[PDB]
Amino acid sequence: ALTNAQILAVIDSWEETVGQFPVITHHVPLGGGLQGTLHCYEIPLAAPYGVGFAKNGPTRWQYKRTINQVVHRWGSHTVPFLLEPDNINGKTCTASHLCHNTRCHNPLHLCWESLDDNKGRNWCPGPNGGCVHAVVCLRQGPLYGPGATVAGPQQRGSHFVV
Amino acid sequence: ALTNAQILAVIDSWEETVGQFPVITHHVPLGGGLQGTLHCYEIPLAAPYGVGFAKNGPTRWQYKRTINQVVHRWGSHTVPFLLEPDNINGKTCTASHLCHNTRCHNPLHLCWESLDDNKGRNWCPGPNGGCVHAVVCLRQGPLYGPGATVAGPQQRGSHFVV
DNA sequence: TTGACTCTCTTAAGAGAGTCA
DNA sequence: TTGACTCTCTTAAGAGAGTCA
Ligand SMILES: [Mg+2]
Ligand SMILES: [Mg+2]
Ligand SMILES: [Zn+2]
Ligand SMILES: [Zn+2]
Ligand SMILES: [Zn+2]
Ligand SMILES: [Zn+2]
């Protein structure tokens, strides 16, 4: 809600509830042929999810609290960042999973960045493979690799140059 | 159904027409601090675009040919790939700009790959910066770099471990 | 047969808000 | 007040199809 105290109280309640989510260990590629381990705090697959939490989509949740007799609601991963600017360079800030695990609500696996920065982590080579993200990746992106391109650049005639 | 010969004729007419589009020289990052040059064949900003071409969205066009009294229509960048498989790994193939210039219709700047592979090129370090795409990038992706993350991973209490 | 418009849809990373009990 | 559902929306890489003359 409006006050900094009220916002801190929301973050604190969220952390306490998410802190009781099951901790699931995931071994992950780091890049450079190395492997690491992440501990994701995973929201349950079905209700009940935790005090204040409800599912609005297959992989979407919201956190809600009643403050000053009014319901305040947020996307479930946005709560750690309620004191941060909600835009950057005219682009909306989004909660971005460094662990690429949507059910995870571990704030140590989240950052707050444009949707383009968020998406791009999917292809990052990872913290031991050349990640240049200033807020460093925790793992190689799941889509990193050579791809599966069916056909490359080509022409039949002689009208084009690269 | 259109025969192989008829499809080749469509591709040839498309190439003839696109080859007469304005050719614009662009200096581009290649990765590794190097600069290169791409020559884009750019569809006009407003009608007329060229024989067979029409705009269906702000940066979307279609190519249309009428063969034996039947109207056939294709997305304007898909025509080079009409003799190729149209899916791979259960994913639809998409025209993918290696030059990242949507108006460009140079077939030497296009490849044919899944939408995920397509998107990922936006963040590629480039052919001189570590590109691992099997069909190599022509330039560093426009969104490559450290990003502009507003807030990184953080907690207020001690409920979490990474 | 052709041009120049019109409309809505897909995907996978993210969102806000309403209906009931 | 809290829980458990419902719906549609945003973005930026990409699509198919209709109307009229
Ligand atoms: Mg993400
Ligand atoms: Mg692209
Ligand atoms: Zn996680
Ligand atoms: Zn990274
Ligand atoms: Zn081009
Ligand atoms: Zn590449």
Is any atom of nucleic acid chain D found less than 7 Å from the CB of residue B66?
A: no
Query: CB distance B112–A151 less than 8 Å?
Result: yes
Could you list which residues have their CB under 5 Å from ion ligand 5?
B 40, 99, 101, 104, 106, 109
* Residues facing A64 on adjacent strands: A73
8-state DSSP, A116: H
How far CA A26 is from CA of A10, A42, A80, A104, B52, in Å, comes to 28, 11, 22, 11, 53
Burial profile A119-133: b = 16 or more Cβ within 10 angstroms, e = fewer: bbbbbbbbbbbebeb
Q: Nearest CA to B96 among A152, A146, A142, A75?
A: A152
Query: DSSP string covering B14-81, please?
Result: HHHHHTTSPEEEEEEEEETTEEEEEEEEBPPSSS---TTEEEEETTEEEEEEEETTEEEEEETTTGGG
Is any atom of nucleic acid chain D found less than 7 Å from the CB of residue A88?
A: no
Instruction: Look at residue B89 and give its three-state secondary structure.
Output: coil
Q: Which residues fall within 8 angstroms of residue B70, CB to CB, at 6 or more apart?
A: none
Q: Sort out which chain B residues have CB atoms less than 8 A from A38's CB and list them.
A: 162
| CA terminus-to-terminus distance, chain A | 55
Question: What's the Rg (C-alpha) of chain A?
Answer: 20
Query: CB distance A132–B145 less than 8 Å?
Result: yes
How far CA B11 is from CA of A57, A148, A156, B114, in Å, comes to 43, 23, 8, 21
Domain residue ranges in chain B: 1-162
CATH number, domain A1-162, options 3.40.50.10420, 3.90.75.10, 3.20.20.10, 3.50.30.30: 3.90.75.10
Q: Are B2 and B10 in contact (CB under 8 A)?
A: yes
For A64, phi then psi, to 5°, come to -135, 145
Q: d(Cα A8, Cα A24) in Å, to the nearest integer?
A: 27
For A87, phi then psi, to 5°, come to -150, 160
Q: How far is Cα of residue B16 from the mean position of the Cα atoms in its chain?
A: 19
> Separation of CA A88 and C1' D21 in angstroms?
48
Q: How far is Cα of residue B154 from the mean position of the Cα atoms in its chain?
A: 38
Is any atom of nucleic acid chain D found less than 7 Å from the CB of residue A6?
A: no
Element holding B96 (H helix, E strand): strand B91-97
Is any atom of nucleic acid chain D found less than 7 Å from the CB of residue B6?
A: no
* Cis upstream peptide for B48 (omega within 30°): yes
* Residues facing B112 on adjacent strands: A151, B95
Q: How far is Cα of residue B7 from the mean position of the Cα atoms in its chain?
A: 21
Instruction: Look at residue A110 and give its three-state secondary structure.
Output: strand
Task: Give residues lining strand C (CB < 7 Å).
Answer: A 54, 56-57, 60, 62, 73-75, 77-78, 94-97, 102, 115, 118-119, 122, 142-143; B 46-49, 51-57, 60, 62, 64-66, 69, 71, 91-92, 115-116
Element holding A87 (H helix, E strand): strand A87-88
Q: A13 vs chain B: nearest CA distance in angstroms? A: 11
Which tokens in the block code for residue A82?
């309620």
Burial profile B63-98: b = 16 or more Cβ within 10 angstroms, e = fewer: bebeeeeeeeebebbbbbbbeeeeebeeeebbbbbb
Which positions of B are annotated as active-site residues? 60, 97, 104, 118
Question: Helices H, strands E: what count in chain A?
Answer: 2, 8
Which tokens in the block code for residue B117?
């592979």
C-alpha count within 13 angstroms, C-beta hemisphere, residue A121:
28
- Centre a 10 Å sphere on the Cβ of residue B23 and count the other Cβ atoms it contains: 15
Q: Are B133 and A147 in contact (CB under 8 A)?
A: yes
Query: CB distance B11–A156 less than 8 Å?
Result: yes
3-state SS string over A23-75?
A: EEEEEEEEECCEEEEEEEEECCCCCCCCCCEEEEECCEEEEEEEECCEEEEEE
Q: Residue B137 C-alpha to ligand 6 middle, in angstroms? A: 4
Q: d(Cα A46, Cα B154) in Å, to the nearest integer?
A: 27
Q: d(Cα A15, Cα A9) in Å, to the nearest integer?
A: 10
Query: CB distance B108–A161 less than 8 Å?
Result: yes
Question: Listing from the earlier edge strand, what are the strands of the sheet with B110-114?
Answer: B87-88, B91-97, B110-114
Q: A110 vs chain B: nearest CA distance in angstroms? A: 5
Q: d(Cα B44, Cα B13) in Å, to the nearest integer?
A: 18
